[PDB]
Ligand binder design. Structure first.
Ligand SMILES: CCCCCCCCCCCCCCCCCC(=O)OC[C@H](COP(=O)([O-])OCC(O)COP(=O)([O-])OC[C@@H](COC(=O)CCCCCCCCCCCCCCCCC)OC(=O)CCCCCCCCCCCCCCCCC)OC(=O)CCCCCCCCCCCCCCCCC
Ligand SMILES: CCCCCCCCCCCCCCCCCC(=O)OC[C@H](COP(=O)([O-])OCC[N+](C)(C)C)OC(=O)CCCCCCCCCCCCCCCCC
Ligand SMILES: CCCCCCCCCCCCCCCCCC(=O)OC[C@H](COP(=O)([O-])OCC[N+](C)(C)C)OC(=O)CCCCCCCCCCCCCCCCC
Ligand SMILES: CCCCCCCCCCCCCCCCCC(=O)OC[C@H](COP(=O)([O-])OCC[N+](C)(C)C)OC(=O)CCCCCCCCCCCCCCCCC
Ligand SMILES: CCCCCCCCCCCCCCCCCC(=O)OC[C@H](COP(=O)(O)OCCN)OC(=O)CCCCCCCCCCCCCCCCC
Ligand SMILES: CCCCCCCCCCCCCCCCCC(=O)OC[C@H](COP(=O)(O)OCCN)OC(=O)CCCCCCCCCCCCCCCCC
Ligand SMILES: CCCCCCCCCCCCCCCCCC(=O)OC[C@H](COP(=O)(O)OCCN)OC(=O)CCCCCCCCCCCCCCCCC
Ligand SMILES: CCCCCCCCCCCCCCCCCC(=O)OC[C@H](COP(=O)(O)OCCN)OC(=O)CCCCCCCCCCCCCCCCC
Ligand SMILES: CCCCCCCCCCCCCCCCCC(=O)OC[C@H](COP(=O)(O)OCCN)OC(=O)CCCCCCCCCCCCCCCCC
Ligand SMILES: CCCCCCCCCCCCCCCCCC(=O)OC[C@H](COP(=O)(O)OCCN)OC(=O)CCCCCCCCCCCCCCCCC
Ligand SMILES: CCCCCCCCCCCC(=O)OC[C@H](COP(=O)(O)OCC[N+](C)(C)C)OC(=O)CCCCCCCCCCC
Ligand SMILES: [Zn+2]
Lengths: 63, 99, 57, 459, 64, 331, 120, 32, 174
């Protein structure tokens, strides 16, 4: 029982810590987007209608 | 006897020949790698990155946009004395009643 | 060993990944047959940009 | 949907071209990757669904079912490694091929845009399911279970085939997008009364509806563990999914045709939940719990309200992970004592301390402890039915009391008390078994943090 | 093994459709279904009449 | 407000730290009972700061920090109500829980699972603070049902004993029959007021509130062990003595009374319910007191004593004195 | 139905007018599925005679695939021809019986009356 | 292994079967 | 600042001034000073550092605007292409109208908390605005069913209009 819980803890933290750290750096050094009016004659791309950096990357790359 | 049939084999304890067995396979090398794939792809990839992927969905089903849009309409309609919400969804200027 | 018994019993680890790439490609080819209303709908029709030639692929 | 169909098909060459001792490792690893890519279907919009091509489309209803379906294949492979260890290699690889075929048919079933295409795939899931039950089940009764599971589904599905073909001849199409706009009201006549029965009986038998459920305690009990998991987690939800779609083209006749089935389900809730209080077989008690949980889904779908539909979708996903978990927990005991009787092995909490924790969590989800998605779905269905008729709260309330009694009775009867003296082969829980439970309960609880992705189109 | 078999698999072959079993299965099986049907049809028929007449309070009822 | 809000949430967050540390194993064993006891102590001093700010100038606030779910026109957000019946109960519960945890270090010293015992006592305390601070019914339902589950796991602590499991399941049985009323109230408010938030329920102030209040009274009947659903509380003495002192004497069986107190803005305008609650409490305070006159088990005498005092709490709610019923909970 | 078609050209696999239609592309998805059936036939041939399923008789397997693709190609030319003839007859009949297929007067949903059935 | 000869059967009619049932259930025929 | 005050009004904040009438020190006064020094100041330093980095990499996101398209009343029967665009428009409006009801409910809930024991009289305007938006929402979106559509909403509207026209005649009958 203890071996399983150690393995379960290790593998959740194997990517849990890098992801937790990565999200922290992005929020500080990249930050969110500011709500702005659409410039005249400018057509935003479909991934420019979202705030968070990670959400804009999911939409730009996958959707 | 009524036939020539093998005896009911006794169940095999996987811990007898391998007290470090993870339960996946009799071969220790195969047993360890089956445990590694399940834990890495199961917990490190799908549950950790999948949960992170879902948490940052691009406005699932446009409910943040809906709140943002309603704020404009409430601001606009109230600033002009218009009703906050009309009781007719379609303008009755282009509806022809039966008789 | 080297490129033997590690390419004869691990080459199968490209079938499913390759199936995803092939499946992804066919979906892109499927959208190419459904472009009868690209930049022609009442809600998203607009003038093309100077360099843009198609609104979406 | 070719980005998911093709990789699933490639799981077959992988199994057959893999090393003899790597069939489980290879298939498990790549089925978890296909599960990973299934999250891309979450690209849903608040007005329009994903319409990939002329054949396949995904909306907020099919997407959670697709993700659940593709997530269960790795779990089924883990759960089957033990009891298939002393099996011929070719027959081990044929068992996996049936599981892959079942996923291939299920993913095409939930995304089919044309109803007749849905029918064929909806019907094709019987063959691999029938083969798993009758070939790799343990007891004699697997043969009779297969016949019941087969002829109950075809006795209702064949009239559905006639009704669907009739609809195309009169409406001109069976594309589900077209029907949304060309649908017409159903005039009240004897002819339409039977078009309603033909369009709904197949899905109710598969739900199952109380009275037509006799196939479920046989099939779900006599099947191997992998069969039971898919049977209770994804294949009961073909009926619920079908009714959600087909009910679009049955208005307004559904508002009075629904009474005999709302009554069977509401009263069937209490009967099936009560049967569990006196079940001697542990695996059979879990089987009857599904009948009682799918009773709420039938009622929610038939009363046709946004809250009932949101509850129905959450219930189907929540029940999928909980019933599947319970079968695996029950099979964990069976693989040690080789008997399904609930009272045979007792006090197992003193011998398997960590497996008793999974029993607790699986029991708390089953009895709908808030804020688990089991309670969210069940609550949303109680709220909607109260508006339908305030008296229904009585029947819904009584079932909640019975549900807690047989959920904790199962926990107390098998885990607490004194251990059986003559059972001395209770070996410590394997890492495979523990990881199998963690792969059920962790997603079930993480969904509480973001419930909206399982609330369906009406969200 | 005799107790579980006696409770599950030995029930049907030792059943005879006689007066005792037919009446018990009729009033316990069909009886509740008919009873609840009229409790709900009456309740919904009464409610629908009030809603059409406009004399049922639904002032803030916008969740169904 | 900057300090009132921050210190009102630190109390709740402080209590969850020992639970979290015991998950990722970021702590050392054999100090856990002492670790958990020290968490309650610091949770008590921090909780006194917001209480003083209330005593000073009667400051109250509602914190809706997390938006969880939006079902069309029903927005569910994690909301905490820091008001009269949250700034006075939390300090009292933490002070009493402080003593019971210290007493448990001695009473349960020889128990091999003393670490699990202090995890369950702490989990119960969290679910009770969720119940007491809940600003909407759904969140109130989380702590309402959570306290029942932790009661079930603590009544049957000595799970090898058959009579312990029977008492544990009996508590669930009577509290489920009470939950039928809780679900009935939630259904009525949603259909008739389109909300589960107490604020909107009070603002609209329904006039025909016989149905929702009868559901709440039924919910209070079970969890507070009033007549008809009383037997479980005396039989909850199967668990270890610390459980009886904490849960089934002072800080769990008062939840039913606390639920009716939170809805005094409705029950003060409904004299039909006041008649029912007054009579329900009056029979309870008499019947259970009469039972204690001849019981020889010391724990059951004090168990029936709690039911009698709980009955006197509901008699107070029946005479339209919600604030005297609350003050009797604390004392 | 179309047995007595005026220009039937009886007992001809592909009448001459069928050469006015696009031939199936050699990358046709239907033609690839037919080729796949030939591959399965080759494998089953080895399996029933207890030969190495994937390796034995590559020459035999190639002829299985070739034979299916060859016959499939012509069975798809006639499939497309017969559906081409159906549409040709269907439209010519409509064009010569205009009074049987009159365009109905389409109205807008603001005009047509549809009864409302409340769901409560 | 367990055979059909030692599983519950139909109601016993003749006194020969009553004794067999009692011997099958490990009861004395007077107690069966 | 962060949110518009026209859509989420907050009345002016009247705070009574301190007027001690005792010699004992006020514990809240000293705890407030400790909180500011130990809690509020280190927190601000972290935020200002974070806020400084955002300015160095400032970028923008926009609010999607949908141009109006012909509604279902202007689509021909069984015309999928025109009905499609009308339907997707009616769904977006349905969602927006759902959030409009949410906003007015937040006003009602916030007013009741803010006014304390005098909310009965001091939140009469918020209550009235909630009783009118709810009426309008119920008229155009209630009883439609799980399979709601623009067609069903249009049919519901035309049934209400016939009932109102049939009421005008019976009103002007004397
Ligand atoms: C959960 C565990 C996983 C967490 C993952 C990492 C997230 C945390 C890192 C982060 O988000 O950036 C934080 C933050 C990001 O900047 P930001 O501008 O504030 O946020 C950016 C966006 O606005 C908002 O950014 P966001 O939208 O990305 O939200 C961040 C986060 C938010 O979620 C959080 O982790 C934190 C939110 C809770 C905050 C604590 C409030 C708790 C409320 C208690 C309520 C009472 C409960 C009682 C019961 O949300 C997520 O990350 C969710 C996705 C990841 C999880 C996937 C699903 C699994 C969940 C876990 C299952 C178990 O950066 C900072 O570090 C701020 C400083 C905070 C420390 C203050 C210290 C002050 C004292 C200084 C003294 C020394 C002075 C020296 C000079
Ligand atoms: C590297 C950052 C480069 C950069 O400055 O781009 C800024 C942009 C700012 O947003 P943006 O969308 O406006 O970027 C400009 C548009 N492009 C890039 C197309 C020119 O954001 C990023 O690209 C970085 C954040 C998203 C990608 C990383 C998230 C992946 C998920 C990781 C989970 C945590 C583990 C790590
Ligand atoms: C104890 C937890 C304390 C709270 C922790 C704080 C963080 C938090 O809770 O919120 C973060 C988030 C929610 O927070 P949020 O929604 O409020 O905001 C997140 C960040 N922003 C603001 C940018 C949106 O948690 C999640 O979203 C978890 C998502 C659940 C993922 C479940 C699926 C993962 C597995 C893949 C599928 C495989 C299983 C298949 C099952 C069938 C599926 C249909
Ligand atoms: C030889 C006897 C065994 C075959 C008969 C048993 C099978 C019955 C079905 C016959 C095939 C279907 C008939 C249509 C067809 O494609 O064949 C005739 C086809 C189609 O020509 P057809 O239009 O005249 O078809 C006549 C048959 N019926 C009435 C059914 C339509 O002719 C050929 O392609 C062969 C001509 C070249 C001869 C070499
Ligand atoms: C919506 C749907 C709602 C209505 C659903 C109703 C339920 C479906 C009908 C029940 C399905 C049949 C259950 C299986 C029956 C069965 O297995 O009987 C077994 C019985 C035992 O004998 P046997 O097995 O053959 O001997 C070897 C023993 N090892 O063998 C027999 O006695 C022979 C039984 C043969 C008949 C079974 C096959 C037909 C089942 C469908 C009915 C046929 C169609 C109706 C007739 C058309 C009109 C003529
Ligand atoms: C226990 C055994 C019980 C067995 C019950 C058998 C019931 C048989 C009912 C006869 C079928 C009724 C029928 O003919 O359909 C009605 C109608 C026929 O006339 P039609 O020309 O289509 O009128 C409109 C044309 N524009 O056609 C229609 O309008 C469409 C109806 C098609 C519906 C599917 C086929 C008929 C119904 C199948 C049986 C329904 C009951 C399903 C129960 C499953 C078990
Ligand atoms: C164990 C087997 C389990 C499987 C069972 C198979 C499913 C049940 C069989 C389907 C029965 C469907 C009924 C078909 C007959 C025709 C129904 C009909 O036309 O009724 C119309 C009638 C008029 O409508 P009205 O209620 O007045 O209000 C609306 C007016 N426009 O409105 C009505 O009459 C109301 C609706 C029909 C009458 C309902 C009466 C229900 C009685 C209790 C049913 C309990 C279940 C019985 C199953 C026994 C087994
Ligand atoms: C329905 C109304 C009829 C209820 C009365 C049943 C008929 C009856 O009472 O007559 C008894 C009849 C003869 O029995 P007997 O004369 O004693 O001896 C010969 C044995 N065949 O008994 C018989 O022999 C045959 C009786 C068959 C009756 C079948 C109908 C009753 C079955 C219960 C209803 C079905 C349960 C539905 C449950 C659905 C939801 C769970
Ligand atoms: C009604 C009953 C409710 C039932 C609840 C069900 C059970 C839930 C279990 C308890 C969960 C408690 C979570 C409390 C924290 C809230 C989570 C969070 O912070 O998410 C990010 C936060 C939320 O923003 P919001 O837009 O309101 O979310 C909308 C989601 N639909 O917005 C933010 O950006 C804040 C995060 C950034 C600031 C973090 C700074 C500290 C980081 C360092 C410490 C770690
Ligand atoms: C199951 C499928 C089994 C199929 C078995 C093989 C049968 C199909 C064989 C087709 C292969 C054709 C070979 C090449 C033919 C060719 O080159 O043409 C020459 C010859 C005559 O051509 P002709 O049309 O007369 O040209 C006259 C021009 N003035 O062309 C011929 O004479 C070819 C005549 C072929 C024999 C007639 C068969 C046609 C009907 C197909 C039967 C199978 C249909 C199966 C449908 C199942 C649907 C799922
Ligand atoms: C990689 C990585 O991130 O590897 C980390 C982990 C292994 O972790 P480990 O270092 O073996 O320790 C953990 C194991 N224990 C505790 C027994 C020592 O990968 C795996 O096993 C992943 C499965 C192998 C195939 C990966 C293919 C990736 C594409
Ligand atoms: Zn075994």
């Amino acid at each position: 029982d203890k071996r399983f819980l150690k393995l379960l803890r290790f593998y959740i933290l194997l990517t849990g810590i890098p992801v937790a750290i990565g999200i922290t750096l992005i929020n500080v050094f990249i930050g969110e987007a500011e709500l702005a009016e659409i410039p005249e004659g400018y057509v935003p791309e479909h991934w420019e209608y979202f705030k968070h950096p990670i959400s804009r990357w999911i939409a730009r790359t996958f959707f | 006897l009524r036939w020539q049939e093998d005896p009911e084999p006794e169940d095999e304890n996987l811990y007898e020949k391998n007290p470090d067995s993870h339960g996946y396979d009799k071969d220790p090398a195969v047993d360890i790698w089956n445990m590694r794939v399940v834990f890495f792809f199961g917990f490190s990839i799908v549950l950790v990155l999948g949960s992170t992927f879902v948490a940052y969905l691009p406005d699932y089903r446009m409910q943040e946009w809906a709140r943002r849009e309603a704020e404009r309409l409430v601001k606009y309609r109230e600033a002009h004395g218009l009703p906050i919400m009309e009781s007719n969804c379609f303008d009755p200027s282009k509806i022809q009643l039966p008789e | 060993m080297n490129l033997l018994q590690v390419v004869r019993d691990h080459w199968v680890h490209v079938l499913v990944p390759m199936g995803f790439v092939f499946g992804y490609y066919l979906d892109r080819k499927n959208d190419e047959k459904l472009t009868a209303f690209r930049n022609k709908s009442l809600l998203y029709k607009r003038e093309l940009k100077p360099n843009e030639e198609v609104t979406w692929k | 949907m070719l980005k998911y169909i093709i990789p699933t098909i490639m799981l077959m060459p992988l199994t057959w071209l893999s090393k003899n001792n790597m069939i489980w490792v290879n298939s498990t690893a790549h089925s978890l990757l296909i599960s990973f890519t299934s999250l891309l279907l979450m690209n849903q919009f608040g007005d329009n669904s994903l319409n990939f091509s002329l054949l396949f489309f995904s909306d907020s209803l099919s997407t959670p079912l697709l993700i659940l379906t593709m997530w269960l294949l790795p779990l089924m492979l883990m759960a089957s490694q033990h009891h298939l260890s002393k099996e011929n290699l070719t027959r081990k690889k044929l068992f996996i091929t049936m599981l892959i075929s079942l996923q291939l048919f299920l993913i095409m079933t939930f995304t089919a845009m044309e109803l007749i295409l849905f029918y064929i795939l909806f019907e094709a899931t019987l063959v691999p399911t029938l083969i798993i039950i009758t070939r790799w089940g343990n007891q004699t009764e697997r043969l009779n279970a297969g016949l019941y599971f087969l002829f109950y589904t075809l006795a209702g599905s064949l009239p559905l085939l006639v009704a669907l073909i009739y609809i195309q001849n009169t409406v001109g199409s069976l594309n589900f997008l077209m029907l949304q706009y060309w649908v017409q009201p159903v005039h009240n006549s004897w002819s339409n009364v039977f078009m309603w029965l033909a369009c709904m009986m197949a899905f109710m038998v598969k739900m199952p509806l109380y009275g037509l459920h006799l196939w479920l305690p046989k099939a779900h009990v006599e099947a191997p563990i992998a069969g039971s998991m898919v049977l209770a987690a994804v294949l009961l939800k073909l009926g619920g999914y079908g009714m959600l779609r087909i009910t679009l083209i049955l208005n307004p006749m559904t508002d009075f045709m629904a009474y005999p089935f709302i009554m069977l389900s509401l009263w069937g809730m209490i009967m099936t939940s009560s049967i569990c209080l006196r079940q001697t077989d542990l695996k059979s008690l879990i089987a009857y719990s599904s009948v009682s949980h799918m009773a709420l889904v039938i009622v929610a779908i038939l009363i046709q309200t946004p809250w009932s539909y949101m509850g129905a979708t959450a219930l189907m996903i929540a029940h999928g992970l909980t019933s599947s978990m319970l079968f695996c927990l029950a099979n964990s005991n069976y693989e040690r004592i080789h008997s399904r009787t609930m009272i045979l092995a007792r006090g197992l909490q003193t011998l398997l301390p960590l497996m008793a924790t999974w029993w607790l969590l699986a029991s708390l989800t089953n009895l709908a402890l808030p804020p688990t998605i089991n309670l969210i779905g069940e609550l949303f269905v109680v709220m909607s039915t109260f508006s339908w008729s305030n008296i229904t709260i009585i029947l819904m309330g009584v079932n909640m009391v019975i549900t807690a009694l047989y959920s904790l009775y199962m926990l107390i009867m098998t885990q607490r008390g004194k251990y059986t003296y003559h059972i001395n082969n209770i070996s410590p829980s394997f890492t495979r078994e523990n990881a199998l439970m963690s792969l059920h309960i962790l997603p079930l609880l993480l969904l509480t943090l973001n419930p909206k992705i399982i609330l369906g189109p009406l969200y | 093994v005799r107790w579980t078999y006696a409770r599950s698999a030995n029930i049907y072959p030792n059943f005879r459709p006689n007066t005792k079993t037919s009446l018990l299965g009729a009033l316990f099986g069909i009886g509740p279904l008919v009873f609840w049907y009229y409790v709900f049809k009456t309740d919904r028929d009464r409610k629908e009449k009030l809603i059409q007449e406009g004399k049922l309070d639904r002032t803030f009822n916008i969740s169904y | 407000m900057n300090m009132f809000s921050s210190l009102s949430l630190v109390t709740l967050l402080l209590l969850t730290m020992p639970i979290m540390m015991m998950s990722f194993n970021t702590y050392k064993p054999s100090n856990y009972p002492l670790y958990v006891k020290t968490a309650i102590s610091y949770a008590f001093i921090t909780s006194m700061i917001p209480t003083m700010m209330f005593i000073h100038s009667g400051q109250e606030l509602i914190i809706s920090n997390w938006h969880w779910l939006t079902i069309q026109t029903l927005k569910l957000s994690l909301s905490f109500k820091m008001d009269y019946f949250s700034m006075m109960f939390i300090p009292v519960a933490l002070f009493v829980t402080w003593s019971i945890m210290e007493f448990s270090m001695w009473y349960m010293y020889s128990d091999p699972n003393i670490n699990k015992f202090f995890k369950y006592l702490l989990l119960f305390l969290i679910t009770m603070l969720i119940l007491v601070t809940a600003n909407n019914l759904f969140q109130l339902f989380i702590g309402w049902e959570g306290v029942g589950i932790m009661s079930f796991l603590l009544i049957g602590w000595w799970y090898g004993r058959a009579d312990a499991n029977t008492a544990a399941l009996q508590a669930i049985l009577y509290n489920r029959i009470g939950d039928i009323g809780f679900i009935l109230a939630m259904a009525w408010f949603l259909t008739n007021l389109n909300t589960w938030d107490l604020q909107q329920i009070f603002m609209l102030n329904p006039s025909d509130s016989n149905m929702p209040l009868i559901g709440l009274a039924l919910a209070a009947t079970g969890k507070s062990a009033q007549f008809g659903l009383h037997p479980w509380l005396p039989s909850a003495m199967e668990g270890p003595t610390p459980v009886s002192a904490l849960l089934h004497s002072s800080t769990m069986v008062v939840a039913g009374i606390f639920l009716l107190i939170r809805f005094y803005p409705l029950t003060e305008n409904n004299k039909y319910i006041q008649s029912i609650t007054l009579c329900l409490g009056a029979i309870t305070t008499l019947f259970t007191a009469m039972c204690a006159l001849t019981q020889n088990d010391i724990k059951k005498i004090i168990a029936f004593s709690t039911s009698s005092q709980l009955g006197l709490m509901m008699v107070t709610i029946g005479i339209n004195q919600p604030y005297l019923a609350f003050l009797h909970i604390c004392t | 139905m179309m047995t007595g078609r005026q220009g039937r050209a009886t007992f001809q696999f592909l009448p001459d007018e069928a050469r006015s239609l696009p031939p199936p592309k050699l990358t046709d998805p239907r033609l690839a599925f037919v080729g796949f059936l030939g591959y399965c036939s080759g494998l089953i041939d080895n399996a029933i005679r207890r030969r190495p399923v994937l390796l034995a008789g590559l020459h035999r397997q190639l002829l299985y695939i070739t034979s299916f693709v060859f016959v499939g190609y012509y069975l798809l030319k006639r499939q497309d021809y017969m559906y081409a003839v159906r549409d040709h007859d269907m439209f010519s009949y409509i064009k010569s019986h205009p009074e049987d297929f009159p365009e109905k007067d389409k109205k807008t949903y603001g005009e047509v009356f549809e009864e409302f059935h409340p769901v409560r | 292994h367990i055979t059909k000869d030692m599983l519950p059967g139909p109601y016993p009619k003749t006194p020969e079967e009553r004794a067999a049932a009692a011997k099958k259930y490990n009861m004395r025929v007077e107690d069966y | 600042d962060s949110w518009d005050k026209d859509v989420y009004p907050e009345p002016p904040r009247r705070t009574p001034a301190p007027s001690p009438q005792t010699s004992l020190p006020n514990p809240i006064t000293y705890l407030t000073k400790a909180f500011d020094l130990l809690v509020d100041r280190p927190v601000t330093l972290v935020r200002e550092f974070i806020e400084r980095q955002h300015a160095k990499n400032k970028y923008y996101y926009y609010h999607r605007e949908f141009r109006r398209v012909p509604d279902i009343t202007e689509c021909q029967e069984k015309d999928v292409l025109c009905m499609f665009e009308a339907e997707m428009q009616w769904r977006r409006d349905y969602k927006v109208d759902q959030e409009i009801v949410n906003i007015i409910q937040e006003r009602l809930k916030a007013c009741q908390q803010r006014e304390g024991e005098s909310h009965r009289q001091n939140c009469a305007k918020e209550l009235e605005q909630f009783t009118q938006v709810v009426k309008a929402y119920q008229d155009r979106y209630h009883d439609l069913g799980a399979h709601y559509s623009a067609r069903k909403c249009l049919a519901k509207q035309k049934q209400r209009m016939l009932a109102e026209r049939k009421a005008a005649k019976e009103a002007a009958a004397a």
